[PDB]
């Protein structure tokens, strides 16, 4: 009956804080505030967070602390018919590990390359440069920080597509190995250590954000970047695309449906106030994004003033923001080597605690389903990370970015949405809100308010569908720069995107032919919760 528990309350919180906080809080968010009406964007963001995000963030956490088991077993016990939810969710977190950990590797490679008196990405007279190189971003040209990250670090120029991955960057394979070594000795003996490793990975970014906020705000032209960041424009409120961007970002920044919030909370005490944990964590997540926004744009404004570069050419999203745009600015300011070291170290610690939970979601949900590998945690996570590293060598290739970009757009993008959708429908309609409220009451003390109950069954499916429907609208064949992916790569992507949620009906169908009885007397069996004995 007894499983292990967090060796301290903060361990759990820092684990959930650490997972939820991501580089997406750095480059997805401050960009969205920029393009969708400044401070006015906080209104659809705030509302979508209140009625959509936090309710879902709460739900999975509550399920974790209640059913006390991983993603596969929790949904198997909740609703036997939709046990496939547990399966679809876990291997989603398995696919992500194939491309997400290469971001941390990039951050380490830059950290190792920052040990110098003159940063290598400042000049345009290097071995890797082209005549189209300029000291900073410009319309029609390339920058020094861009060609460094592209032609030297990635050597992406030597690739003609995903069909041609080229050679293997062993300086990159080393960094990837280093990452998996760190993720290894952190999750190897479980929450006893992983609940302590997060004390660094989830706290250091805030330390770095502090001294980057100070450095960023002392720069000349820092206040100008703040204006670009938060100058109100309530015309965006009328735009549904803004409400979509607000809804999307809110949902993807809290990250339910990875079975990690489910896994993490499953190590909590049964009578732990999980309601306070959900509200606290979700806020800090959104608050972290807000803080990071100042850090970026104070530096971004500094470039648009004392370096003479258009704000349109620096207000960038994606990895380009912190691998090209931001380091270029650091290179100009005094004590550049210092800011460069702590910035890339921040980026590394921003992904580790997220990767921890992503991997932990796998290990935990598998240990509760198959008792054999629970006694074999070390030997299992050995082969798992070895598989990650082996396949991860494809990410360390010259055309490794093309493989990374394919998985990024397919593996987690759509697979999550229709998985979390079935999560909300199962709990609120199949399982039912009235007995879910009964569980939470028995745990923390009080049944959820009418607000959370309405949000869980009416607002949540609409919210998720509203996001899913617009992501369908803005779809266009996978493209990066000039390179258009061949339609077999897109087909390959949809397979990886489909191999997840294909578990929902498949397991439902397979677990429907058993056990014996009429059609009506089997839906009853497969909707009967495990705790009716």
């Amino acid at each position: 009956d007894e499983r292990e528990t967090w060796s301290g309350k903060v361990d759990f919180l820092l684990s959930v804080i650490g997972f939820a906080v991501d580089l997406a809080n750095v480059w997805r968010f401050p960009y969205l505030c920029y393009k969708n009406g400044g401070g006015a964007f906080l209104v659809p963001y705030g509302i979508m967070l209140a009625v959509g995000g936090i309710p879902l963030f709460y739900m999975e956490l509550a399920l974790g602390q209640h059913n006390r088991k991983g993603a596969i077993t929790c949904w198997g016990r909740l609703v036997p018919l939709f046990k496939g939810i547990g399966y679809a969710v876990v291997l989603i977190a398995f696919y992500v590990g194939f491309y997400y950990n290469v971001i941390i590797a990039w951050s380490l490679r830059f950290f190792f390359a920052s040990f110098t008196n003159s940063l290598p990405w400042t000049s345009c007279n290097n071995i890797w440069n082209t005549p189209n190189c300029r000291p900073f971003e410009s319309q029609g040209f390339q920058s020094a920080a861009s060609e460094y990250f592209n032609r030297y670090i990635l050597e992406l120029n030597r690739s003609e597509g995903i069909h041609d991955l080229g050679a293997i960057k062993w300086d990159m394979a080393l960094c990837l190995l280093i990452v998996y070594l760190i993720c290894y000795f952190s999750l190897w003996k479980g929450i006893s250590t992983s609940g302590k490793v997060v004390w660094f990975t989830a706290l250091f970014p805030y330390a770095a954000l502090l001294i980057l906020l100070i450095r960023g705000l002392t720069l000349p032209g820092s206040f100008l970047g703040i204006q670009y960041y938060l100058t109100p424009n309530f015309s965006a409120i009328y735009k549904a695309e803004v409400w979509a961007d607000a809804a999307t970002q809110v949902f993807f920044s809290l990250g339910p449906g990875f079975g990690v919030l489910l896994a993490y909370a499953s190590y909590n005490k049964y009578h732990n106030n999980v309601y306070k944990d959900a509200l606290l964590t979700s806020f800090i997540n959104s608050a972290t994004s807000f803080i990071a926004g100042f850090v970026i744009f104070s530096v971004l404004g500094y470039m648009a003033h004392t370096l003479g570069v258009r704000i349109e050419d620096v207000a960038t999203e994606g990895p380009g923001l912190v691998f090209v745009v931001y380091p270029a600015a650091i290179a100009t300011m005094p004590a550049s080597t210092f800011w460069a070291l702590i910035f890339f170290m921040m980026l590394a610690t921003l992904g580790l605690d997220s990767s921890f939970g992503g991997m932990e979601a796998i290990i935990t949900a598998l240990s509760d389903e198959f008792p054999k590998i629970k006694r074999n945690r070390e030997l299992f996570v050995a082969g798992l990370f070895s598989l990650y590293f082996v396949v991860g060598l494809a990410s360390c290739t010259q055309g490794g970015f093309y493989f990374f970009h394919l998985l990024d757009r397919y593996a987690a993008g759509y697979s999550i949405l229709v998985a979390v959708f079935f999560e909300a429908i199962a709990v609120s309609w199949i399982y039912g809100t009235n007995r879910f409220s009964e569980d939470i009451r028995d745990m923390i003390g009080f049944p959820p308010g009418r607000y959370w109950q309405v949000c869980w069954r009416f607002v949540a499916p609409i919210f998720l569908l509203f996001i899913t429907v617009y992501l369908l609208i803005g779809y266009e064949p996978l493209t990066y720069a000039d390179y258009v992916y061949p339609s077999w790569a897109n087909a390959l992507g949809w397979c990886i995107a489909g191999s997840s949620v294909v578990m929902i009906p498949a397991v439902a169908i397979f677990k429907l032919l058993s056990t014996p009885g009429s059609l009506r007397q089997r839906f009853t069996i497969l909707t009967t919760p495990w705790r009716d004995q």
């Epitope: 009964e438 009451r441 009080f446």
Partner: antibody, heavy 119, light 109 residues
């Protein structure tokens, strides 16, 4: 609005069995965890059993457990308490309460039914 | 069990006085889990003060609550004749639930 009435109760000889009932009205009964609390003739309060809004989580006292069986009927809004192997200590005025929210306690108490267990 | 002890058992008081009844627990009790009940003679108890200090609905502002851990107390600022009853404190911290021994108010003459 909210009104709780306790039926059953009476004189029962030691070892006997009696079923107490509580008729609720004025609230969605299937949303409030009911609970039985008895009061000895020396006006001393003692908790007996709590039942959830769905009757899935049951809690008993140690002086009572093994003998009593609290029951719920959210359909007809009735709270039951089936007692067996009664002893003289069980002699009390049994009350019906609805402590759905723990951090608040029992907000409404019934009139109370009297049980005397004597030979 | 988490036995609650209230002192004092019978308390005499002329109207206007300020009275204080105490409730100490054998074990540490969460602050928001301790509640108070008033039971007038020949009547069922009533929720009087929930969550240590928060007065219940209908309870005059002359009542108050204070305490933490293993020591709580109910206090009536200015006693009126219609406050003559028996007051039970109750901890919700854990199961099994336990009521205090109760204190009895009696007016002076």
């Amino acid at each position: 609005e909210v009104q709780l009435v306790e039926s059953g109760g009476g004189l029962v000889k030691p070892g006997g069995s009696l079923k107490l009932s509580c008729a609720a009205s004025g609230f969605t009964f299937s949303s409030y965890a009911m609970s039985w609390v008895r009061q000895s003739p020396e006006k001393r309060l003692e908790w007996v059993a709590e039942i959830s809004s769905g009757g899935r989580y049951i809690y008993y006292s140690d002086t009572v457990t093994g003998r009593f069986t609290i029951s719920r009927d959210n359909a007809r809004n009735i709270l039951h308490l089936e007692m067996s192997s009664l002893r003289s200590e069980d002699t009390a005025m049994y009350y019906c309460a609805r402590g759905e929210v723990r951090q608040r306690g029992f907000d409404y108490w019934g009139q109370g039914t009297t049980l005397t267990v004597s030979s | 069990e988490n036995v609650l002890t209230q002192s004092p058992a019978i308390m005499s008081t002329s109207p206007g006085e300020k009275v204080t009844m105490t409730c100490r627990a054998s074990s540490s009790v969460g602050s928001s889990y301790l509640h108070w009940y008033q039971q007038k003679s020949g009547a069922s108890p009533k929720l009087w003060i929930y969550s240590t200090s928060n007065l219940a609905s209908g309870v005059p502002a002359r009542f108050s609550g204070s305490g933490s851990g293993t020591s709580y107390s109910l206090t009536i600022s200015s006693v009126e004749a219609e406050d003559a009853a028996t007051y039970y404190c109750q901890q919700f911290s854990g199961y099994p639930l336990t009521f205090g021994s109760g204190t009895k108010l009696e007016m002076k003459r």
